[PDB]
Design an enzyme around this catalytic site. Structure first.
Site, mmCIF file in Angstrom:
data_model
loop_
_atom_site.group_PDB
_atom_site.id
_atom_site.type_symbol
_atom_site.label_atom_id
_atom_site.label_comp_id
_atom_site.label_asym_id
_atom_site.label_seq_id
_atom_site.Cartn_x
_atom_site.Cartn_y
_atom_site.Cartn_z
ATOM 1 N N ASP A 196 0.873 -1.364 0.077
ATOM 2 C CA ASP A 196 -0.024 -0.146 -0.086
ATOM 3 C C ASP A 196 0.763 1.137 0.046
ATOM 4 O O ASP A 196 0.205 2.369 0.074
ATOM 5 C CB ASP A 196 -1.229 -0.045 0.995
ATOM 6 C CG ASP A 196 -1.909 1.165 0.943
ATOM 7 O OD1 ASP A 196 -2.369 1.112 -0.322
ATOM 8 O OD2 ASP A 196 -2.602 1.680 1.997
ATOM 9 N N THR A 220 -8.264 5.027 -0.671
ATOM 10 C CA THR A 220 -8.524 3.925 -1.126
ATOM 11 C C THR A 220 -9.821 3.434 -1.186
ATOM 12 O O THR A 220 -10.346 3.564 -0.014
ATOM 13 C CB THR A 220 -7.539 2.920 -0.225
ATOM 14 O OG1 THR A 220 -5.813 3.269 -0.405
ATOM 15 C CG2 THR A 220 -7.531 1.526 -1.056
ATOM 16 N N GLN A 270 -5.459 -1.527 -7.273
ATOM 17 C CA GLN A 270 -6.244 -0.653 -6.317
ATOM 18 C C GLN A 270 -6.578 0.528 -7.181
ATOM 19 O O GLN A 270 -6.297 1.024 -8.164
ATOM 20 C CB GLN A 270 -5.104 -0.163 -5.366
ATOM 21 C CG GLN A 270 -5.796 0.962 -4.369
ATOM 22 C CD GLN A 270 -4.778 1.359 -3.250
ATOM 23 O OE1 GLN A 270 -4.950 2.570 -2.917
ATOM 24 N NE2 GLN A 270 -4.285 0.454 -2.488
HETATM 25 C C1 COA Z 1 -15.109 4.548 1.390
HETATM 26 C C2 COA Z 1 -14.843 6.075 1.010
HETATM 27 C C3 COA Z 1 -14.794 5.975 -0.583
HETATM 28 C C4 COA Z 1 -15.802 7.014 1.739
HETATM 29 O O1 COA Z 1 -16.781 7.288 0.450
HETATM 30 P P1 COA Z 1 -18.036 8.628 0.970
HETATM 31 O O2 COA Z 1 -18.384 8.450 2.299
HETATM 32 O O3 COA Z 1 -18.911 8.129 -0.426
HETATM 33 O O4 COA Z 1 -16.958 9.639 0.436
HETATM 34 P P2 COA Z 1 -16.900 10.792 -0.583
HETATM 35 O O5 COA Z 1 -15.979 10.332 -1.667
HETATM 36 O O6 COA Z 1 -18.100 11.338 -0.869
HETATM 37 O O7 COA Z 1 -15.969 11.471 0.377
HETATM 38 C C5 COA Z 1 -16.089 13.361 0.436
HETATM 39 C C6 COA Z 1 -16.580 13.510 1.978
HETATM 40 O O8 COA Z 1 -16.715 12.292 2.898
HETATM 41 C C7 COA Z 1 -16.566 12.663 4.045
HETATM 42 N N1 COA Z 1 -16.253 11.263 5.039
HETATM 43 C C8 COA Z 1 -15.250 10.892 5.149
HETATM 44 N N2 COA Z 1 -15.042 9.736 5.896
HETATM 45 C C9 COA Z 1 -16.497 9.505 6.040
HETATM 46 C C10 COA Z 1 -17.421 8.714 6.548
HETATM 47 N N3 COA Z 1 -17.024 7.592 7.334
HETATM 48 N N4 COA Z 1 -18.862 8.873 6.356
HETATM 49 C C11 COA Z 1 -19.214 9.952 5.836
HETATM 50 N N5 COA Z 1 -18.605 10.542 5.337
HETATM 51 C C12 COA Z 1 -17.186 10.669 5.320
HETATM 52 C C13 COA Z 1 -15.279 13.439 3.884
HETATM 53 O O9 COA Z 1 -15.002 14.348 5.145
HETATM 54 C C14 COA Z 1 -15.358 14.292 2.509
HETATM 55 O O10 COA Z 1 -15.965 15.622 2.704
HETATM 56 P P3 COA Z 1 -16.614 16.225 1.147
HETATM 57 O O11 COA Z 1 -17.978 15.517 0.957
HETATM 58 O O12 COA Z 1 -16.464 17.676 1.511
HETATM 59 O O13 COA Z 1 -15.546 16.013 0.044
HETATM 60 C C15 COA Z 1 -13.498 6.632 1.399
HETATM 61 O O14 COA Z 1 -13.572 8.019 1.526
HETATM 62 C C16 COA Z 1 -13.074 5.715 2.664
HETATM 63 O O15 COA Z 1 -13.319 6.476 3.809
HETATM 64 N N6 COA Z 1 -12.132 4.904 2.475
HETATM 65 C C17 COA Z 1 -11.875 4.214 3.820
HETATM 66 C C18 COA Z 1 -10.581 4.925 4.326
HETATM 67 C C19 COA Z 1 -9.500 4.021 4.615
HETATM 68 O O16 COA Z 1 -8.581 3.966 3.717
HETATM 69 N N7 COA Z 1 -9.513 3.316 5.613
HETATM 70 C C20 COA Z 1 -8.235 2.730 6.093
HETATM 71 C C21 COA Z 1 -8.487 2.011 7.375
HETATM 72 S S1 COA Z 1 -9.591 0.572 6.699
#
Ligand code: COA
Ligand code: NA
Lengths: 277, 265
Positions: A196, A220, A270
């Site tokens: 990663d 990711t 990825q």
């Molecule tokens: C899964 C993931 C794609 C979330 O998607 P999403 O909730 O649809 O997020 P978006 O791409 O619309 O994200 C944008 C927003 O979400 C917010 N956000 C972050 N984590 C969040 C959560 N758990 N729930 C809701 N919103 C969240 C951000 O603050 C961001 O702000 P913006 O709307 O002003 O841009 C990704 O952002 C993520 O969190 N991946 C996992 C993180 C990771 O790598 N974890 C490692 C340990 S397992």
């Protein structure tokens, strides 16, 4: 070696019950690689000792809280004649943050072929990422300055704070900072972790945006890997990464990991979110 | 057309409940399960979110005489992404698991690699053409036709033009299910090419372990598409392939990856 020993100890999980493990975090949101490595450890504990990982797929659903333990639940899916499959759920605060399914196979000789390790400069002629980083400034996400569990030597430096328009390819030599135990499985956890790094940001290269620049959202979504052949991580390995595509606010990367002799060790894929705000 | 019309119907699933679907089979072809699983999942997702990725494992051979049940778990509904896990059930057992992710169409950074230099599809004979020198739902024009019973030592690369044998609806979702189906053709057998063995040779055990795909871009399957397949590896009785799919203009539209059993009895 202290950095390496701390990491290895972290990927050696606490057993709570059959297929229930508890892992601590590096502390310094959690790194994708830590979750992956710990998940592999968890799943491998539930499988016959001979059947070693050959592939996994994972989705990252939520950020991990680095200040809290992670529970890994391991679901037994199938134990066949050759293959054992497992689903690892990484859980924090009652929510799943990550799922992995993994598959383990009984060793056996079979058909053998592979592509060719790309032509690149050896690691003896390249600076380490931590030496290059000193020059840069910093945010205080400083996994760039300390001693690291894995030494990274890039063929070409990519400043996380300032992109330059470049081809969507990256080549990085890497190696465990210390001698590793003589146990393939531990090298596998560590390799999953290592896979990663220097990965998703490759997709930003043509767009000339550093992955740490203000307002750049990079995360990711999924991470999958295939362990083709045995290897050791206490000698140099090469990560060849390309980003074949970006679109839709997403970025897509594929990687191949070679030992110094040129043997194809592992392949990775990825996709992530890459959004300039 | 006919064969196409029956495939499309057989990918329109019988709804049993919310997140439970029943599909007829045409052992099962991998692509059918894949394509069906995608329908299942897409039914449980907000309208605007379309599939951008999935991963799957094959646990058991699917009995082609019986139908398959697709159960769908809702994993997450985020700001932009929705994720679902489909279990395909037969004879009270899981034969297959897919997790899939859906996203809103959004503008972002764009780049892609370059489509391989191959003969165009217009000069090429279809596989049914070659067969003489029934109708398939998808027309295949291989750059190089392989004999499933006779292998010879070839480079681990394969290139096939394909198209839907018929006019399709203006509904990206259907083109996606079908692409899902199509992606399991002219794939894992590429891994055998360096070994001068056809997949249908006697004593050749060849079975899909996992199949994953990324839908980078929108597309139509009623115009020509190239499947560019390499087998970057084979080892420990497995074989590994990577695929990329471009439209006729060279637009990279999807990528795929599968590992499989390849064993000589
Ligand atoms: C899964 C993931 C794609 C979330 O998607 P999403 O909730 O649809 O997020 P978006 O791409 O619309 O994200 C944008 C927003 O979400 C917010 N956000 C972050 N984590 C969040 C959560 N758990 N729930 C809701 N919103 C969240 C951000 O603050 C961001 O702000 P913006 O709307 O002003 O841009 C990704 O952002 C993520 O969190 N991946 C996992 C993180 C990771 O790598 N974890 C490692 C340990 S397992
Ligand atoms: Na369990």
């Amino acid at each position: 070696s202290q950095a390496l020993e701390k990491l290895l100890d972290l990927l050696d999980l606490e057993k709570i019950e059959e297929g229930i493990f508890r892992g601590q975090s590096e502390d310094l949101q959690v790194f994708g690689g830590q979750v992956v490595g710990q998940a592999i450890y968890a799943a491998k504990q539930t499988v016959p000792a001979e059947r070693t990982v050959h592939s996994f797929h994972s989705y990252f659903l939520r950020p991990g809280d680095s200040s809290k333990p992670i529970i890994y639940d391991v679901e037994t899916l199938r134990d066949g004649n050759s293959f054992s499959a497992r689903r690892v759920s990484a859980i924090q605060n009652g929510k799943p943050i990550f799922y992995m399914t993994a598959s383990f196979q009984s060793q056996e000789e079979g058909f053998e072929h592979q592509n060719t390790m790309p032509d690149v400069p050896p690691p003896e002629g390249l600076m380490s990422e931590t030496d290059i980083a000193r020059q840069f400034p910093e945010k205080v996400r400083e996994k760039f300055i300390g001693p690291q569990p894995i030494e990274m030597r890039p063929v070409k430096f990519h400043n996380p704070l300032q992109g330059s328009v470049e081809e969507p390819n990256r080549y990085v030599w890497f190696r465990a900072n210390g001698k590793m135990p003589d146990d393939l499985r531990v090298h596998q956890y560590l390799l999953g972790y290592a896979s990663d790094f220097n990965f998703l940001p490759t997709a930003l290269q043509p767009h000339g945006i550093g992955f740490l620049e203000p307002g750049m959202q990079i995360a990711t979504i999924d991470h999958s890997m295939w362990f083709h052949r045995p290897f050791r991580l206490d000698d140099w390995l090469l990560y060849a990464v390309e980003s074949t595509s970006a679109s839709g606010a997403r970025g897509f990367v594929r990687g191949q990991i070679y030992n110094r002799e040129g043997v194809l060790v592992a392949s990775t894929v990825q996709e992530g979110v890459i959004r300039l705000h």
